[PDB]
Amino acid sequence: LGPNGLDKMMVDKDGDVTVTNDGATILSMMDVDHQIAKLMVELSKSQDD
Amino acid sequence: TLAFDEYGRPFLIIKDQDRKSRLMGLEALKSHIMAAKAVANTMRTSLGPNGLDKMMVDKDGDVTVTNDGATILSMMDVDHQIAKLMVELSKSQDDEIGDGTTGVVVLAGALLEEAEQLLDRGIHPIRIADGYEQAARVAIEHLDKISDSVLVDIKDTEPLIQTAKTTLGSKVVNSCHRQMAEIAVNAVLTVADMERRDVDFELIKVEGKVGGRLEDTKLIKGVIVDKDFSHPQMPKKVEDAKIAILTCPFEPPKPKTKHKLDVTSVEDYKALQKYEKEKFEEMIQQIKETGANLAICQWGFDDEANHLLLQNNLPAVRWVGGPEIELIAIATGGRIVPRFSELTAEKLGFAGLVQEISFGTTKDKMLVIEQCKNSRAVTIFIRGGNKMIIEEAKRSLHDALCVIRNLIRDNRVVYGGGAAEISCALAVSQEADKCPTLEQYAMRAFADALEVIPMALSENSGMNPIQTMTEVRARQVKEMNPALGIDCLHKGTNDMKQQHVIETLIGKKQQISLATQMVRMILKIDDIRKPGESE
Amino acid sequence: TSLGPKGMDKMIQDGKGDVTITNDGATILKQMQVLHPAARMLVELSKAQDIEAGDGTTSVVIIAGSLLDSCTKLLQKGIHPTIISESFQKALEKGIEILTDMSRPVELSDRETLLNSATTSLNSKVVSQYSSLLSPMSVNAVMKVIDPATATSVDLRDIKIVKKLGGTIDDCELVEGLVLTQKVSNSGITRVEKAKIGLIQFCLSAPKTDMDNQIVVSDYAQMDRVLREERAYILNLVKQIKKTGCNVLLIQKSILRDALSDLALHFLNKMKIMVIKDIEREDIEFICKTIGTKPVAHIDQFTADMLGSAELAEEVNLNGSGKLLKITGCASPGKTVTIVVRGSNKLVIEEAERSIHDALCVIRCLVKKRALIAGGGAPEIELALRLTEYSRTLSGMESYCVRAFADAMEVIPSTLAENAGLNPISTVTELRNRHAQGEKTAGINVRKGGISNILEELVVQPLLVSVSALTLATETVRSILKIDDVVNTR
Amino acid sequence: MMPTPVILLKEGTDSSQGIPQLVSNISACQVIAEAVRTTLGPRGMDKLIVDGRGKATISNDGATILKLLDVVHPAAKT
Amino acid sequence: GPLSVFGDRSTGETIRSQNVMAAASIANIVKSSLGPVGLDKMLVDDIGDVTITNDGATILKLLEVEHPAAKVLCELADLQDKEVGDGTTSVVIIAAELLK
Amino acid sequence: APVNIFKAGADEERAETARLTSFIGAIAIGDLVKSTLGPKGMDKILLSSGRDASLMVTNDGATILKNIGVDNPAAKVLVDMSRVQDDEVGDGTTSVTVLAAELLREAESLIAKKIHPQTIIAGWREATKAAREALLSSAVDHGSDEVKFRQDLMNIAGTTLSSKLLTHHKDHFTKLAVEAVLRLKGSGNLEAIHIIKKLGGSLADSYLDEGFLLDKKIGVNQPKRIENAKILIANTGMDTDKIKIFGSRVRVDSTAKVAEIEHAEKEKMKEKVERILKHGINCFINRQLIYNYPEQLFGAAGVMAIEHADFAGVERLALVTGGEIASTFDHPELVKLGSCKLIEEVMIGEDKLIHFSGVALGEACTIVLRGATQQILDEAERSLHDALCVLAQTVKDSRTVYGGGCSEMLMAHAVTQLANRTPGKEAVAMESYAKALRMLPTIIADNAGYDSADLVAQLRAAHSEGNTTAGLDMREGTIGDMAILGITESFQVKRQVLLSAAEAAEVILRVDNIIKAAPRKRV
Amino acid sequence: APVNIFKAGADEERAETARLTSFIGAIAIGDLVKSTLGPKGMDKILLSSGRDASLMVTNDGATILKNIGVD
Structure with missing residues (x-):
C-alpha cells in the first residue's frame, strides 16, 4: 500500500513468474480455498473494473 | 564356460561361482596402484608446517579434529584389501619410531605411482620390485654418511629441545612451541635409564581436565589421582606426609571360605558385639603406631572407621584404583601392605605437600604432590579450552616424548627440511647409471619417487615445485653438498644448520625400509578373489 | 592391440543383433558407443581422419591419448593449462618441418610407388593374404578414372562396390x-x-x-x-x-x-x-x-x-x-569402374568392403600430395630424437612441456614392438640408437622379427598421414585441456 | 521326459554316464589347476584370497591356495 | 578408470576359449550322423511340429544358435548347399577341428 | 502466513526466506559463468539427460545460461536479462550477468545493516546516473581518415575473439570478421555472411570465399561449367502447376481425348520453359523442385538449372547476383539478369559445391570453417557470429570505450566521488554500487591467476590521479595504457551492461513476498 | 577421492563443501543465541515433541545450546 510499499512475486501454475504491483493480478493468481476470502478478491476486481 | 558345458550340462567347480570375480592380467597391478593413489592423495594434504587438519566423525556421532596420521588412517571405512595394508604401514612406523605417520604413506605411494610407467614399458612386475631394492640400498648407505650430534643427555640439552621443537612445529600447539618442548624434555630425562638407554612408558602419565588454556600445562613431579576423603570434615592439607598404602577394607576381617557362624546363647550374641567393636579400634591404632598420618586404601571404609579416622587425626581417601596405588607406592618409595597387622614404619611412603585442587564450579578434587624423594615417575597435566585441543595436545606431547626416547636409543641425527631426501635422490641418480644393465629405468624411478616429499612440502608451503626443486638440487651440486632444504617463510636462507631442523637417523632408516617392503608385497600379486553378494 | 600388421581384430555386437568383425579403428570406436563426455572427443577425432585422409585412423587416437597422458605429470607440477597448450603448439610447428625431412617426391606415372603404397595399407587387413590380387586391383580402380596429370583430387564415389555371397576373395572382379x-x-x-x-x-x-x-x-x-x-x-x-x-x-x-x-x-x-x-x-x-x-x-x-x-x-x-x-x-x-566383392561369410565381405576403400584412399592422398615417407615407426623415432634436441635449447616451463609432447611420440614404435612379440625395452632403445647414428630409414620389421631397412621391405606411407595425424590430434587435445567445468543441465 | 514311472525308484537323483561325464571330470581338473599355474618357479606371483570373515590371505603355496577355493565338483576335489 | 561402455566386454583368453566351446557345441550335433553307420535325429519345436532328418543343413537351419562363433559354422553349412549341393556334414566337423 | 492457511495447494514465503532464497538462487548464476570472464577463462561442457544428449562445449554466458533450466522463480530474472544482452549487441553477456549478481550480493549485506530496501534502490539509481555520465564523457569517436577507422574495427574484433576458442588463431579469424562486414557496405542483415562447417584441417585453414557457394549439384543432363555466365533466379513452378481452377475435372467420352489433352499439358510446359529461355541465360536457380520433363528441356537448351538451393537461398542469390526473384515470366525485357565468371564446382571437405566466382555486385560472402572435431566447429562458428554481430553495429555507431577494466574504474570513480557528497543514509548504498563495478576487473584478474590484490590497488591508484586510460595488462600481469595496447570495447555494449544490470537488479530488491501456485501435472 | 570410492558406507567431502558446511553450521549457532546478547534480549521456548516434553523457558546461551541437539 502506497508509494513506499513493496511488490510481490507471483509464480503461475505453468512456471511463468511476474512481479506485480496491482492488487487485481496479485489476488487473481492465488489458489484461495475459502468462500468468503474469494469474495474479498471479487471486491478488488470490482474496484479495478 | 562356467555353468554351461559343450554338452549342454551345467559346469560347477566352486561354490557360488556365478557370484565371484577374477581379473588378473596387468589389471590387478594397475588396480592396486590406482587404489594407492586414492590413499596418497589423502595424506599428502597434511605434510609439512602448513599441513591441514582432518575432521573425523565416528560411527556413534563423536567428532574429533586431529592432525596425527595415526588418528586419521585408523578411522577409515575403506573396504579394499590393499588400501588396508597402507594403514598397517603407518602403524608399523608408529609402533617402532612414532614419527612418520604421514611420510611412509606418501613415499610408498610415490613408489607405486612411479612404477606405473615401468609396467607400461614391459618390465616384468617382479623385476620392478627387485630393482627398488638395488636403489634403496644406495639411499640407505648414503643416509648414514651425513650425521652428527653433541647431545650427552646430562645438561647440554639444547639440541634435544630443538628436536622437540621440530616435531611439535607440525602440531596445533605452537602457541606453546617452547613450553611443551621443555615439558617433554624434562618428563623423559627425569625417568629415563641412562645405563641401558631404556625409557619405560609407564613412568610418564598424561592427565587432563577441560578448562583454562594450553599455556597452563604443567609437569608435576609426582602423581595425580581422584581424591575423595572419606570424612567430609577431614583437613585437606598435609605438610609432611607419611603414607600408608593398604589393600584391605576398613572392616572386621572375614574368611574367604564359607563360614556360617553358629550363635546359640545370649552370651554368644552379646560377646560378639564386644569383639567386633574391638576390631574397629585395633585396625586404626595399628596405623598410628607406625607414625603414619595419611592412609590411601584400595577399598572403602565402614562408617565406624570414619569416626576413628577423625578422632585419631588420620586423613584417608577411599576406592583408589589398582594402577593408582601401584604408582603411588613406587613414586613415594613405599610398599603395598596386605593387612592391618602387617603394618610397619619401614613400608611407609615419604612425600611433601599433599593438596587437592578444585576447578571452577566442579568437584573434581585432583591431587597435587609438591615434593618427592628421588621419584622415578612424573605426571603431565594438560589444560585446554575445549575437548578437541586437549586430546590433540595429548598426541602432540606423545610425539615429542617419542622422538626424545628415539634419541636416547640412538643419538645419531640427520638434517631435515627435505635435505636428506633430496640428497638421497641425487645419490641414487649418480649410481643409477652404474650400471644400466636391465634396471636403469627402475633405479631412476626410485630416485624420482624420493622427491615426492620436498615436492609435496613445497606445494603445501605455497611454492612451485619446479622452481623450488631445480634451485636446491643445483645448489647441492655446484658446491660441496650443504644441508640445504626448503621452507615456507624461507627464514632468510634454507640452511638447515641455522634453522635447527633436526630429525632422527633411525626414523628415516625405518621409513625407507618399511615403505619398500610394503610396496613389494602388494606389487607381486596378480589375482584377487573377493566374494560378492551373499545371495 | 589393433595397430600394425601383427594386430588383431575385434568383434562388437549391438542391441539389435548386428555382429561385426573389423580391424579399422574408426569402425571399432563407432560401435563401442562410449558414453563418457571426454572420451567421445576421440570418436570425432577418428571421424575427421576418415574424411581428410581415409587411412589415418588408428594412429591418430593413440597419439591423442598419449598427448593427454603426457600432461598429467605436467599438471601435477602446477603448470598452468595455458602453458601446456602453447608448448604443444610450438612442438607441432617444429614436428611438421621434421616430417618433411624424410619426404621423397614421386610422380603418378611410377607404377611401383603406387603398387607398393596400396600394398602397405593392406598389411593390417584381414585380406593381407590376398594382396597379390587386391593391390593391382586397388591401383587400377583409381588410376584409369581420375585422368592422371589433369587434376589434384580424386572423387572415390565413382568406384562402386557390389557385394555377393559366394566364392572367395580370389574371385573378385x-x-x-x-x-x-x-x-x-x-x-x-x-x-x-x-x-x-x-x-x-x-x-x-x-x-x-x-x-x-x-x-x-x-x-x-x-x-x-x-x-x-x-x-x-x-x-x-x-x-x-x-x-x-x-x-x-x-x-x-x-x-x-x-x-x-x-x-x-x-x-x-x-x-x-x-x-x-x-x-x-x-x-x-x-x-x-x-x-x-x-x-x-x-x-x-x-x-x-x-x-x-x-x-x-x-x-x-x-x-x-x-x-x-x-x-x-x-x-x-x-x-567409372565397379568392384565385385566375394566371400564365404557375410562378416568377411563387410570387412573386405572397408579394406577396399582403405586401399583406394591411398592414391587419393598421393594425388593430393605426391610425397611419401618410410613407415615402420621411422618418423616417430625421428620426431622423438629431433624434438628432444629442440627441447634441450629451451628454457623455463617450455623445457618440461615440449619434452612431454616428444615423449608421446614413442607410444607407436613401442606398441608395434609389443604387438609383434618383440621386447620393446631393447627394440625401442635400438631404434633410437640407430636413428641417432643416422639410419633414418630404420624401423620395425615384423617379417624378420627385428629392426631392418623399411624401404627395402616396401613399407611406405603417404606424407599426408603423418602430417594430418599430428595436426588433428594436437588441435583436439589442446581443446580438451581448455574445457574444464562439467555442468549437468536440468 | 523318459523316466516317468507311476512309482519312482529312488526320489529325484541326478545321474550322468559315459563319455560326456569323463570329459566333464577331466575338464574340472583342468580348471582347478589354473589356481596354481602362475605360482611355479622363482618368478611366480602371489594370490590374494578373501574369506567369509573379510580377512585376506596372501600366499603362493599350493597347500594354502587349494584349501580356500571352495571346490564342490566331485572330480576337482581329487 | 574402466570404459564407459554400457554393455559387457571380455578380452584375452576368455573369448579365445569360448569360441572353441561354441564351435564344438555345433560339431557335436552332426558328428553323430556321419556315414552309413550314423543315426537319425528327431527335431520337435515348441508347438509340436516334428521333423525327421539326419542332414547337417536341415538340422542347423532349424536349431537356433546364439553365440556369434556358432553362427559361423551354420553359415558354412548353408554355403556348401549353394556351391555343391551335397556333402554338408564334413565342412562343420573339419572346420571345428581346425579351431580346436 | 503459516498460521491459519486458507490456500488449496499453494504456499508462500514472507520476509524470512523469500529474500534469502531469492538472493542465493540468483547470485549463484554469477558464480556459474564467473569463470568465463576475461581472456584466460576456462570453457564449459553442458550435458543433457539423454535421448541424443547433443553435448555442447561453449564459453559464452548466454549459451550456458539458456540451457541450464533454472527452476527458481527469482533466479529466472537474471536469465532473461542475459537473453536480452545476447539479442541486442551479442557480446558482454558474461559481464552483465556477473555485475548484476555482485550488485545483489551487496544488497543482501546492506539489508543485514537494517537499511530499508527502498533506500538501497534509491542509492543505486543515483549511482547508476553517475556511472552513465562516466561513459558519456569518456567515449572515443571515429569519423573520417579510414586508415584509423579500419584499425578500430581490428581492435574490436580482436578483443571479442580473444575470449573464445579462437585464441591463437587471431591472425586468420580477425580478418575473416572485419573484412566480411566491410564487403557488405549495407544493412547489417547478419545473414549475408554464411558459414559452412566441414571436418578436416585445422582452424587456421579456414578461408573466406570471395563468391557464393550453392548446394544441389548441377543437374543430370546439363553443362557443368560455363564461362561468363548470365544468371537468372526464379521462384516459380516447374510442374504440377494446376493453374488456379479448384474443382475441375476432365470428363470425356473416350480415352483418345485424354491422350490429346496430355499432349497439350506438355506443350504448355514446353512453352513455359521457352519463355524463360528467351531471356538469354546460362544458369537458372528455382526455389521449387525441378521435374524430369523441364530438366530435359533445360539440358537440351544447354542451360543448367538448380532446384531448391534453400528456402531463402533465392533471396540471398538476388543480393549477391544483382537480380530479382522473378516468380513470373511474361515480359523478358523487364527482367534483370546477373553475371559471373565461373560456375564451376569445387571440392571442399570431400563435398562438391557450386562456386559462383567473380560475381558482379557481390554484396555477400561465405566463410569456409574447418576444424578437427564437431565441438571445435560449433564453438568456432559461434565465435564468428559473435564478432560479426558487434562489428555490424560498430560500423554504425563508431563510439568506443577503453577496455581492460578502464571503463569500469572510471564509472566506479564517478560514483565514489559523488557518493562522498551525499548523506550516509544513501551514501552507503551508492558506495556499494561502486564496489560492484570494481568487482569486474577483480574477477578478470582472478580468473587468469594474477595477484588481484595489487592490480586493483594499482589501477584505482592510477585512476585517482588522471591516467584515465589505465587498465589491466593481461599478458604481463601489470597495469598498462589501453590506448597504446589497443584494447577497446564498443560503447553500446558497455552502455547496456551498465543499464541492464541496474534495471534487472531492482526487480529482486523490490520483492519481499513470493506466492507459489499449486503445481500441475506432478504425481 | 570422489572417483574410485573404496568406502563401504562412508563418505568424505574436500575443499568445496567441507569448509562451506563448517561455516554454515557455525553461523547457524551464532544466529540462534544472537537474540540473547545484551540487557534487552528475548527469551526462547524450548520443547520436545512428547515423552515428557520438558517445556523450558531460558535466556542463557549455554542453556539454550545444550538442549538443541546439534547434528
Whole structure:
C-alpha cells in the first residue's frame, strides 16, 4: 500500500513468474480455498473494473 | 564356460561361482596402484608446517579434529584389501619410531605411482620390485654418511629441545612451541635409564581436565589421582606426609571360605558385639603406631572407621584404583601392605605437600604432590579450552616424548627440511647409471619417487615445485653438498644448520625400509578373489 | 592391440543383433558407443581422419591419448593449462618441418610407388593374404578414372562396390562396365550382342493427365471405343521405340503411374527388346556416366541421339545369393569402374568392403600430395630424437612441456614392438640408437622379427598421414585441456 | 521326459554316464589347476584370497591356495 | 578408470576359449550322423511340429544358435548347399577341428 | 502466513526466506559463468539427460545460461536479462550477468545493516546516473581518415575473439570478421555472411570465399561449367502447376481425348520453359523442385538449372547476383539478369559445391570453417557470429570505450566521488554500487591467476590521479595504457551492461513476498 | 577421492563443501543465541515433541545450546 510499499512475486501454475504491483493480478493468481476470502478478491476486481 | 558345458550340462567347480570375480592380467597391478593413489592423495594434504587438519566423525556421532596420521588412517571405512595394508604401514612406523605417520604413506605411494610407467614399458612386475631394492640400498648407505650430534643427555640439552621443537612445529600447539618442548624434555630425562638407554612408558602419565588454556600445562613431579576423603570434615592439607598404602577394607576381617557362624546363647550374641567393636579400634591404632598420618586404601571404609579416622587425626581417601596405588607406592618409595597387622614404619611412603585442587564450579578434587624423594615417575597435566585441543595436545606431547626416547636409543641425527631426501635422490641418480644393465629405468624411478616429499612440502608451503626443486638440487651440486632444504617463510636462507631442523637417523632408516617392503608385497600379486553378494 | 600388421581384430555386437568383425579403428570406436563426455572427443577425432585422409585412423587416437597422458605429470607440477597448450603448439610447428625431412617426391606415372603404397595399407587387413590380387586391383580402380596429370583430387564415389555371397576373395572382379541388381522381364532373351541402350522415363501404360480423368459411358459400343483405343495407344508407344533401333531398355521406377503395362511388355517381348525394370531415380546418374545414355521424358523425343552402345549385355547366372546383370564394353567408356566383392561369410565381405576403400584412399592422398615417407615407426623415432634436441635449447616451463609432447611420440614404435612379440625395452632403445647414428630409414620389421631397412621391405606411407595425424590430434587435445567445468543441465 | 514311472525308484537323483561325464571330470581338473599355474618357479606371483570373515590371505603355496577355493565338483576335489 | 561402455566386454583368453566351446557345441550335433553307420535325429519345436532328418543343413537351419562363433559354422553349412549341393556334414566337423 | 492457511495447494514465503532464497538462487548464476570472464577463462561442457544428449562445449554466458533450466522463480530474472544482452549487441553477456549478481550480493549485506530496501534502490539509481555520465564523457569517436577507422574495427574484433576458442588463431579469424562486414557496405542483415562447417584441417585453414557457394549439384543432363555466365533466379513452378481452377475435372467420352489433352499439358510446359529461355541465360536457380520433363528441356537448351538451393537461398542469390526473384515470366525485357565468371564446382571437405566466382555486385560472402572435431566447429562458428554481430553495429555507431577494466574504474570513480557528497543514509548504498563495478576487473584478474590484490590497488591508484586510460595488462600481469595496447570495447555494449544490470537488479530488491501456485501435472 | 570410492558406507567431502558446511553450521549457532546478547534480549521456548516434553523457558546461551541437539 502506497508509494513506499513493496511488490510481490507471483509464480503461475505453468512456471511463468511476474512481479506485480496491482492488487487485481496479485489476488487473481492465488489458489484461495475459502468462500468468503474469494469474495474479498471479487471486491478488488470490482474496484479495478 | 562356467555353468554351461559343450554338452549342454551345467559346469560347477566352486561354490557360488556365478557370484565371484577374477581379473588378473596387468589389471590387478594397475588396480592396486590406482587404489594407492586414492590413499596418497589423502595424506599428502597434511605434510609439512602448513599441513591441514582432518575432521573425523565416528560411527556413534563423536567428532574429533586431529592432525596425527595415526588418528586419521585408523578411522577409515575403506573396504579394499590393499588400501588396508597402507594403514598397517603407518602403524608399523608408529609402533617402532612414532614419527612418520604421514611420510611412509606418501613415499610408498610415490613408489607405486612411479612404477606405473615401468609396467607400461614391459618390465616384468617382479623385476620392478627387485630393482627398488638395488636403489634403496644406495639411499640407505648414503643416509648414514651425513650425521652428527653433541647431545650427552646430562645438561647440554639444547639440541634435544630443538628436536622437540621440530616435531611439535607440525602440531596445533605452537602457541606453546617452547613450553611443551621443555615439558617433554624434562618428563623423559627425569625417568629415563641412562645405563641401558631404556625409557619405560609407564613412568610418564598424561592427565587432563577441560578448562583454562594450553599455556597452563604443567609437569608435576609426582602423581595425580581422584581424591575423595572419606570424612567430609577431614583437613585437606598435609605438610609432611607419611603414607600408608593398604589393600584391605576398613572392616572386621572375614574368611574367604564359607563360614556360617553358629550363635546359640545370649552370651554368644552379646560377646560378639564386644569383639567386633574391638576390631574397629585395633585396625586404626595399628596405623598410628607406625607414625603414619595419611592412609590411601584400595577399598572403602565402614562408617565406624570414619569416626576413628577423625578422632585419631588420620586423613584417608577411599576406592583408589589398582594402577593408582601401584604408582603411588613406587613414586613415594613405599610398599603395598596386605593387612592391618602387617603394618610397619619401614613400608611407609615419604612425600611433601599433599593438596587437592578444585576447578571452577566442579568437584573434581585432583591431587597435587609438591615434593618427592628421588621419584622415578612424573605426571603431565594438560589444560585446554575445549575437548578437541586437549586430546590433540595429548598426541602432540606423545610425539615429542617419542622422538626424545628415539634419541636416547640412538643419538645419531640427520638434517631435515627435505635435505636428506633430496640428497638421497641425487645419490641414487649418480649410481643409477652404474650400471644400466636391465634396471636403469627402475633405479631412476626410485630416485624420482624420493622427491615426492620436498615436492609435496613445497606445494603445501605455497611454492612451485619446479622452481623450488631445480634451485636446491643445483645448489647441492655446484658446491660441496650443504644441508640445504626448503621452507615456507624461507627464514632468510634454507640452511638447515641455522634453522635447527633436526630429525632422527633411525626414523628415516625405518621409513625407507618399511615403505619398500610394503610396496613389494602388494606389487607381486596378480589375482584377487573377493566374494560378492551373499545371495 | 589393433595397430600394425601383427594386430588383431575385434568383434562388437549391438542391441539389435548386428555382429561385426573389423580391424579399422574408426569402425571399432563407432560401435563401442562410449558414453563418457571426454572420451567421445576421440570418436570425432577418428571421424575427421576418415574424411581428410581415409587411412589415418588408428594412429591418430593413440597419439591423442598419449598427448593427454603426457600432461598429467605436467599438471601435477602446477603448470598452468595455458602453458601446456602453447608448448604443444610450438612442438607441432617444429614436428611438421621434421616430417618433411624424410619426404621423397614421386610422380603418378611410377607404377611401383603406387603398387607398393596400396600394398602397405593392406598389411593390417584381414585380406593381407590376398594382396597379390587386391593391390593391382586397388591401383587400377583409381588410376584409369581420375585422368592422371589433369587434376589434384580424386572423387572415390565413382568406384562402386557390389557385394555377393559366394566364392572367395580370389574371385573378385574389377569390371569396367555397368553392374545392375535389377531384373529382366521377360527372361526369354537374357543376352543381347552389339546393343543400343536407351534410358526411358516415360510410362508405357494408359494415358493419364495431371487432372482427374473420367471416361463416361453412355451407350453400348462406347466401352469398345475405350478398350480398342488404349490398346492402340500403348502399341504406338512401342512402335516409336522399335523404329528407333534400340535393343535394350532401361526403365526408371515410377510411383504414381505404372511404368510397364502388361500389354507394353507383350509387344516388346515379341519385338525382341530386352527390358531392365525398377531402376531407382538415384541410379541414373551412374548409368549416364558409365554407358552414356540420356533419359527421355517425352516419348516423342525418343530418337537415336539418346542411345548408347554395349558390346555384350548378359545376365550372369551365379550360384550364390541370387544373380546380377553385367553390361561390358561400349564406345567412349566413362570415368567409372565397379568392384565385385566375394566371400564365404557375410562378416568377411563387410570387412573386405572397408579394406577396399582403405586401399583406394591411398592414391587419393598421393594425388593430393605426391610425397611419401618410410613407415615402420621411422618418423616417430625421428620426431622423438629431433624434438628432444629442440627441447634441450629451451628454457623455463617450455623445457618440461615440449619434452612431454616428444615423449608421446614413442607410444607407436613401442606398441608395434609389443604387438609383434618383440621386447620393446631393447627394440625401442635400438631404434633410437640407430636413428641417432643416422639410419633414418630404420624401423620395425615384423617379417624378420627385428629392426631392418623399411624401404627395402616396401613399407611406405603417404606424407599426408603423418602430417594430418599430428595436426588433428594436437588441435583436439589442446581443446580438451581448455574445457574444464562439467555442468549437468536440468 | 523318459523316466516317468507311476512309482519312482529312488526320489529325484541326478545321474550322468559315459563319455560326456569323463570329459566333464577331466575338464574340472583342468580348471582347478589354473589356481596354481602362475605360482611355479622363482618368478611366480602371489594370490590374494578373501574369506567369509573379510580377512585376506596372501600366499603362493599350493597347500594354502587349494584349501580356500571352495571346490564342490566331485572330480576337482581329487 | 574402466570404459564407459554400457554393455559387457571380455578380452584375452576368455573369448579365445569360448569360441572353441561354441564351435564344438555345433560339431557335436552332426558328428553323430556321419556315414552309413550314423543315426537319425528327431527335431520337435515348441508347438509340436516334428521333423525327421539326419542332414547337417536341415538340422542347423532349424536349431537356433546364439553365440556369434556358432553362427559361423551354420553359415558354412548353408554355403556348401549353394556351391555343391551335397556333402554338408564334413565342412562343420573339419572346420571345428581346425579351431580346436 | 503459516498460521491459519486458507490456500488449496499453494504456499508462500514472507520476509524470512523469500529474500534469502531469492538472493542465493540468483547470485549463484554469477558464480556459474564467473569463470568465463576475461581472456584466460576456462570453457564449459553442458550435458543433457539423454535421448541424443547433443553435448555442447561453449564459453559464452548466454549459451550456458539458456540451457541450464533454472527452476527458481527469482533466479529466472537474471536469465532473461542475459537473453536480452545476447539479442541486442551479442557480446558482454558474461559481464552483465556477473555485475548484476555482485550488485545483489551487496544488497543482501546492506539489508543485514537494517537499511530499508527502498533506500538501497534509491542509492543505486543515483549511482547508476553517475556511472552513465562516466561513459558519456569518456567515449572515443571515429569519423573520417579510414586508415584509423579500419584499425578500430581490428581492435574490436580482436578483443571479442580473444575470449573464445579462437585464441591463437587471431591472425586468420580477425580478418575473416572485419573484412566480411566491410564487403557488405549495407544493412547489417547478419545473414549475408554464411558459414559452412566441414571436418578436416585445422582452424587456421579456414578461408573466406570471395563468391557464393550453392548446394544441389548441377543437374543430370546439363553443362557443368560455363564461362561468363548470365544468371537468372526464379521462384516459380516447374510442374504440377494446376493453374488456379479448384474443382475441375476432365470428363470425356473416350480415352483418345485424354491422350490429346496430355499432349497439350506438355506443350504448355514446353512453352513455359521457352519463355524463360528467351531471356538469354546460362544458369537458372528455382526455389521449387525441378521435374524430369523441364530438366530435359533445360539440358537440351544447354542451360543448367538448380532446384531448391534453400528456402531463402533465392533471396540471398538476388543480393549477391544483382537480380530479382522473378516468380513470373511474361515480359523478358523487364527482367534483370546477373553475371559471373565461373560456375564451376569445387571440392571442399570431400563435398562438391557450386562456386559462383567473380560475381558482379557481390554484396555477400561465405566463410569456409574447418576444424578437427564437431565441438571445435560449433564453438568456432559461434565465435564468428559473435564478432560479426558487434562489428555490424560498430560500423554504425563508431563510439568506443577503453577496455581492460578502464571503463569500469572510471564509472566506479564517478560514483565514489559523488557518493562522498551525499548523506550516509544513501551514501552507503551508492558506495556499494561502486564496489560492484570494481568487482569486474577483480574477477578478470582472478580468473587468469594474477595477484588481484595489487592490480586493483594499482589501477584505482592510477585512476585517482588522471591516467584515465589505465587498465589491466593481461599478458604481463601489470597495469598498462589501453590506448597504446589497443584494447577497446564498443560503447553500446558497455552502455547496456551498465543499464541492464541496474534495471534487472531492482526487480529482486523490490520483492519481499513470493506466492507459489499449486503445481500441475506432478504425481 | 570422489572417483574410485573404496568406502563401504562412508563418505568424505574436500575443499568445496567441507569448509562451506563448517561455516554454515557455525553461523547457524551464532544466529540462534544472537537474540540473547545484551540487557534487552528475548527469551526462547524450548520443547520436545512428547515423552515428557520438558517445556523450558531460558535466556542463557549455554542453556539454550545444550538442549538443541546439534547434528
